[PDB]
Design a binder for these strands. Sequence first.
RNA 1: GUAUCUAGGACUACCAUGGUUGCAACGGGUAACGGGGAAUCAGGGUUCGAUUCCGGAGAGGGAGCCUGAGAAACGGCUACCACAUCUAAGGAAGGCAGCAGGCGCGUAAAUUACCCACUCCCAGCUCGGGGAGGUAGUGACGAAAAAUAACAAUACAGGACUCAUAUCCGAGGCCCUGUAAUUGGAAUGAGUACACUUUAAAUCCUUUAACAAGGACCAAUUGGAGGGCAAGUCUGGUGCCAGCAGCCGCGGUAAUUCCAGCUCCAAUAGCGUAUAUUAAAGUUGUUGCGGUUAAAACGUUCGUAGUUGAACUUGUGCUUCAUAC
Lengths: 126, 58, 143, 181, 87
Amino acid sequence: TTATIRTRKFMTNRLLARKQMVCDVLHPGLSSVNKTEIREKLAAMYKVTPDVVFAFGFRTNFGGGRSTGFALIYDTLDFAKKFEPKYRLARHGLFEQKKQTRKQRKERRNRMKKVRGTAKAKIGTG
Amino acid sequence: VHGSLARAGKVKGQTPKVEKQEKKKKKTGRAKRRIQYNRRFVNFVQGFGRRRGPNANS
Amino acid sequence: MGKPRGLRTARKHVNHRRDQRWADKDYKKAHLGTRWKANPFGGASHAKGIVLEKVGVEAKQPNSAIRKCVRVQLIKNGKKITAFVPRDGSLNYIEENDEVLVAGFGRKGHAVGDIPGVRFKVVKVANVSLLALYKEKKERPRS
Amino acid sequence: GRIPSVFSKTYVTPRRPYEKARLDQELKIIGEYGLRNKREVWRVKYALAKIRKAARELLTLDEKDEKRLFQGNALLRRLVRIGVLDESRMKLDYVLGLKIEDFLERRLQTQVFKLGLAKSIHHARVLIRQRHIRVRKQVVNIPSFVVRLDSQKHIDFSLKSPFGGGRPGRVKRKNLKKNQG
Amino acid sequence: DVITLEKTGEFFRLVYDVKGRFVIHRISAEEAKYKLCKVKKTQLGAKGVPFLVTHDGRTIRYPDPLIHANDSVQVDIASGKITDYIK
RNA sequence: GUAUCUAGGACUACCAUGGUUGCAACGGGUAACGGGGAAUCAGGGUUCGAUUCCGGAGAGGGAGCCUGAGAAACGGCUACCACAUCUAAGGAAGGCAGCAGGCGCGUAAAUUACCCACUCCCAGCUCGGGGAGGUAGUGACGAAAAAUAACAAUACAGGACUCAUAUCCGAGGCCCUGUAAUUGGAAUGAGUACACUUUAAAUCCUUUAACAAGGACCAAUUGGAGGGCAAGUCUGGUGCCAGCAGCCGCGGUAAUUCCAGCUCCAAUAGCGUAUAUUAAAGUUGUUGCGGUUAAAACGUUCGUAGUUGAACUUGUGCUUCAUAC
C-alpha cells in the first residue's frame, strides 16, 4: 500500500563515516515490513546502495502501520567493515562467525592451566 | 471433664448433603454488577410499603 | 500537675518517661523480649508441630459443650500447646502423629472466649489446610 | 539491581467497610459507570484522596509563595488537560469541592456512549477492553484512560479490524462460507 | 578543556550550564587554541626555581612573580606557556 | 625512647596520682552494624532497618606472614583448634556468610539455563577474560494496568407519558433498566498462530494474516448473613450432641447463628487467616491521660543531686520627612 518511508533526525557523523538516522516507516493500513525491504527503499534516497544501509532499530508501534526505527548508512563499505559492531554485519551476513557455544571452551581453558607450560599438548586433549 | 470424642462427625454423615442444583451461572463483573443494580435500585423503584426483602421467601 | 515544665528540665522528662513506659504493657513485651523468652512461638508467625493427642475440652459456663482441641508439640521447642480445630468436624481430619500448622487466635495470647486455655488455632493438617478439606475442594495426601 | 521498584498502593479500601449508605453510593457508581468491581471504584476514590490532600497542603501556603505557585498551577493545568476542570475551577480553592464522578467520565467507557457508536455507557466499555478503540493511530486495550481533551475527537473505529472494513465478521465470513458449503 | 573532533571540526569547550551540568558549547577554532586555568598553588623550589600549578594539574615552570593563588592564566596549550594573567 | 606511613600509652623505662561516675559511669542484655532510609499516621509521634546506596566489619573460629602503591588476604600462604577430602598408606592438598545446586534448620525464600550484545571493569588490550552485570526460567512478599461480553428484539417485568378510568381497574408504549439458556446478525483480541518486530540468538510485550463468543462458550472468587457487621427470625437434617463463635453469644426439636440447599450480601484476580507493627489507644500522655471513691499520695518531714526561681537594670519619646487612609 505504497509505504513511503520518510526518515527523521539526521546526523552527519564523519567520525564513524555514517549518516545515523531515525526511520519513520508508514504502511498505514497494513503494518510490518522486513528490514531487507527497509534497506532497499532507504538506499535509493541517499544514493548509497542497499547493503550499506545497516538499519537496526525498530518497534512496530501502537495498532497500525508505523514503525519508528534507526538506520545507519556508511559511506564506504571499507569503513562499514571496520567499525562494524561485528554482529550487525552478520545478520545480513556476508560475515558468518563461529558459535562456540562457549562453556565448552571454558572447560578446555581450565584443563590447559593444570600442566606446565606446553599448552599445545592440551589443545590436543581438548 | 473427660466427656469422650466418640460422637465425632455423626452429623456430617447423617446429613444427606442436599444436591448442588445450580440455577444459572451469574456473569463476570462488569455485566453482573450492573445486572444487580437493576435488582437493588431500578427494579426496585420500591413501593413505599414500609421496607421489603432481598431474602424474603413468602 | 506534676511534669517538670521548666526550661532546662530536659533530662527529667526522658528519665521519668522511661520510668512510666516501664509499666507500658506493650513496651514491656517488646524491651524484655518476652516473645522469644516465654511465649511458645518465638515471635514466629507459624509453627509446625506434631500431634500428640486429641482433647475433649469442656467449655466454661453458661456453655455446656465439648469443644475439641488438639495437643501439639512444636518442632523448634518441643513445647506443648493446645490448639483449637476451627471449622467443621475437624478432629476426623487431624489424625494423631500428623504434621499440623499451629497459628494463634488473634488475642495477644489470652484464651479464646469460653474455651479454657486454648490460645491457638490449627490451620492445616498434612500441608493441605483444614479449610480446603471441609468444603471438599481438596483431598488429603495419603500418608 | 539497580534500585527499581517504587510502589505506591493506589488502593485504600475504606476505613469502615460495612456502612449501608456508603455501600449504596459505590454500588450506584458501578451502575452509572460499569466498573467491574468496587476496587475499580477504590482506585478513583483513593486517586481523589491523593488529589484532595495535595490541594489542601498547598492551600495553607500563602499565594505568592513560589512553592505553592509552581506546583498548584501545574496540578491545576494537568486536571484541566484531563477535562476534570473548567476554567472557573482552575483555582486550588475549587479543587477541594471535587467529586468522584468528574474523573470517571473522562474514561472512554463513558465517552463512546456520548458519541453514538455505543448509545450506552455499557456498550462503550467492553469494546475498549478487548481492543476496539483508536486514539488517533493507536489501538488501545486499556479502558481506564482518563482521556485528555484534545484526543476526544480522534475516537474512532480501528482501521484494519473489520469496522474500519477489513476482515468483515469474521462471522460474515463464517456465514458466507455456510451458503458456499 | 578543549575537545577537538578534527574530522569534522566542531571544536568544543566544556563549560557549565546554569543547571550545574556540562554543556555542549561550540567555540571558534582560534578560541580553541588556548584555555583559562585557575591557579591552585604557587610554590618555590622545583626547577628552575618557582613553579605554578593549575586546577587541571598542569605545572608551568617559572611563573610571573605577581601570580598569586586563585588567579587565572591563559595557557597557550601548544606550548604549556602562560600568556596572560588576571589577578 | 622505640615502633610505624603518621600524631599517639600504640609500646617501654623512669617519674607523678591521676582518669571515668546518679547529666546513670562500670557491668549485663539486645531477633543491636550505623546512617541515608522504610512503615503507620491529623499533626505530634511510634515502629522499623537483615537486605537494592554509602561507610566500616568479616569470610569455620583465631593467630602470624609474603608480595605489592596498597591484603595481617582466603575463589594467597604458614600454623593451631573445629570441620571436610583423596590416597597404590608414604603423604598431599581445601574454605559456596561467591553464582547455581544439595543437605540440614526452620514459618520462611528460585535454574546444577544462556551471554559479554547492553552496562562497564581489568589486563600488555580496538580484539581477550568476566554467574560484576545483562538475559531468560522460577516468583499472588509487593506495587501497577483489567480478558472473561455487548445491543436491538422476543417471552414477560417494572417507572413516567397518553387513552383512560380515577381504592379497584384495562389498553397503547418510551429514554431505560432488567428476570428469561428465545433470537438475530454484529464488535475486538485476550488466548492461539504464519509473518514481521524483539533479542547476542531466542522469549513475552508492542505489530498482524489464518483461528477462537449463544456460555453448558473465551465457563471467577473468597468469607459472611443474630449482633459487632453488610445480608434469611428461610427450607430440610441435627437438637446445649455434632459443632459454630476474634468478642457478646448460638445449639436443651418454628435453629434467622450449626451442616447443606436456596436466596443474598461485602470485598473479586483477589479474598480469608496467622504473626509483628501502627491507627483507633486519650491503653503512655513532649504534643496530650488519670490519682476522694473507678487501677492512684509515698506515714510524715528534713534534704542533696536533680529541678525551678519575683520585681528593678537603651530607653521611652518629641519633631519633622518621606508613605497607607
